[PDB]
Design a protein around this ligand. Structure first.
Ligand SMILES: *[C@H]1O[C@H](CO)[C@@H](O[C@@H]2O[C@H](CO)[C@@H](O[C@@H]3O[C@H](CO)[C@@H](O)[C@H](O)[C@H]3O)[C@H](O)[C@H]2O)[C@H](O)[C@H]1F
Length: 300
C-alpha cells in the first residue's frame, strides 16, 4: 500500500520525495464542499477510489464560509472521518481550510490557528497528513507579501509545535495562480509547497510557463485543485486542454487533486446524479469529467 511504501514525505530541492529520498507523485480527488456533499466522503467511497481509480491521495475540502466551518463547526468532524479513513486505507490525505468568499486568509486566522492546532495534535504523528492552510486567497488587495505570507507565518508555527515536518501546502494569490510571486519570496519552512490551481476551460500555455518559472526558483508546487471545466466549475468539459495539463504535470512530476467528487449538475463534477455515495460506480454513474479523471489515474 502507498503510505507503507513511501512513508514520510518531505521536500528535497523543490521536489516532493518519500522517506528514501525518491521522487513521488500523488494523484487523487478532492471532495466538493463538505457542508454540501459530505455524503460522498466516507471509508467505502474512498476505498473504491483507491481500488478502482488508483488514487493515492484524498483532499477534504472544508469550506470556512458559505455554510462551512465558521457557520457550523460540525464539518470538522467530517474532516476527521476523512483523515481516519485515509489512515485506514493507507493513502495520503489533505486537510483543506477552504477559504474562497472569505478571500483574505487573515479574516479567520484565529479560527484557523485553533483548527490546525487541534488537527496537528490529533494526527501529527501519522505520515498520511498534508495540511492546506488557505485554499484560494483572492482579490487585488490580498498579496503574497502583505497578506498570505504573514498569514502562513502565523499558522505554520502552530502546526510545527505539534508536527515538525509533515507537508504544508500554502495558497497563492489570484485564486492560487500566482506562484511566480510566492516563488520569489519563499517561506522558511523546508517542507512547504505552494498551491497552483487551473481549469482546462482557460487556455493555459502561459500558466504552464509560470509554473515552470516557480519550479526554477526551487519552489515546490502542489496542484491541489484543478478541473476539466471552466473556472466556475461548470461551463463545459475541455478534454484537449486537460490532457495537455495532465502531460505537463507528469513531465514536471507534479502531484494533484481533481475537483471534484460530487454528483452536482456542473461540468467539473465527477459523478452523475444517482451515483452511490459509498462507491461501486458503474460507467453510467461517472460523468464525462469523472470518466476522464478515472482513466488518467488508472493509466498512471
Ligand atoms: C476552486 O475552483 C472551483 C471551481 O470554481 C470551486 O468550486 C466551485 O465553488 C463554487 C462556490 O462555492 C460552487 O458553487 C456553489 O455550490 C454550492 C453547492 O451546490 C451552492 O450552494 C452555491 O450557491 C454555489 O455558489 C461550485 O459548485 C464549485 O464547483 C472551488 O471552491 C475553488 F476552490
Amino acid at each position: 500500500s502507498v503510505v507503507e511504501e513511501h512513508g514520510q514525505l518531505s521536500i528535497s530541492n523543490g521536489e516532493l520525495v518519500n522517506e528514501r529520498g525518491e521522487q513521488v507523485q500523488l494523484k487523487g480527488m478532492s471532495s466538493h464542499g463538505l457542508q454540501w456533499y459530505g455524503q460522498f466522503v466516507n471509508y467505502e467511497s474512498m476505498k473504491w477510489l483507491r481500488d478502482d481509480w488508483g488514487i493515492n491521495v484524498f483532499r477534504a475540502a472544508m469550506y470556512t464560509s458559505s455554510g462551512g466551518y465558521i457557520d457550523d463547526p460540525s464539518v470538522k468532524e467530517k474532516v476527521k472521518e476523512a483523515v481516519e479513513a485515509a489512515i485506514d486505507l493507507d493513502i495520503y490525505v489533505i486537510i483543506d481550510w477552504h477559504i474562497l468568499s472569505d478571500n483574505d486568509p487573515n479574516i479567520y486566522k484565529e479560527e484557523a490557528k485553533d483548527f490546525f492546532d487541534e488537527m496537528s495534535e490529533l494526527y501529527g504523528d501519522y505520515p498520511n497528513v498534508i495540511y492546506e492552510i488557505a485554499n484560494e486567497p483572492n482579490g487585488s488587495d490580498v498579496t503574497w507579501g502583505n497578506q498570505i505570507k504573514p498569514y502562513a507565518e502565523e499558522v505554520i508555527p502552530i502546526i510545527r509545535n505539534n508536527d515538525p515536518n509533515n507537508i504544508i501546502i500554502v495558497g497563492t494569490g489570484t485564486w492560487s495562480q500566482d506562484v511566480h510571486h510566492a516563488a520569489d519570496n519563499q517561506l522558511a519552512d523546508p517542507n512547504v509547497m505552494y498551491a497552483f490551481h487551473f481549469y482546462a476551460g482557460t487556455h493555459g500555455q502561459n500558466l504552464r510557463d509560470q509554473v515552470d518559472y516557480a519550479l526554477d526558483q526551487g519552489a515546490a508546487i502542489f496542484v491541489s485543485e484543478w478541473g476539466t471545466s471552466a473556472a466556475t466549475g461548470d461551463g463545459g468539459v475541455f478534454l484537449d486542454e486537460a490532457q495537455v495539463w495532465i502531460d505537463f504535470m507528469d513531465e514536471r512530476n507534479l502531484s494533484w487533486a481533481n475537483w471534484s467528487l460530487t454528483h452536482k449538475d456542473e461540468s467539473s463534477a465527477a459523478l452523475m446524479p444517482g451515483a452511490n455515495p459509498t462507491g461501486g460506480w458503474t460507467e453510467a454513474e461517472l460523468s464525462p469529467s469523472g470518466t476522464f479523471v478515472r482513466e488518467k489515474i488508472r493509466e498512471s
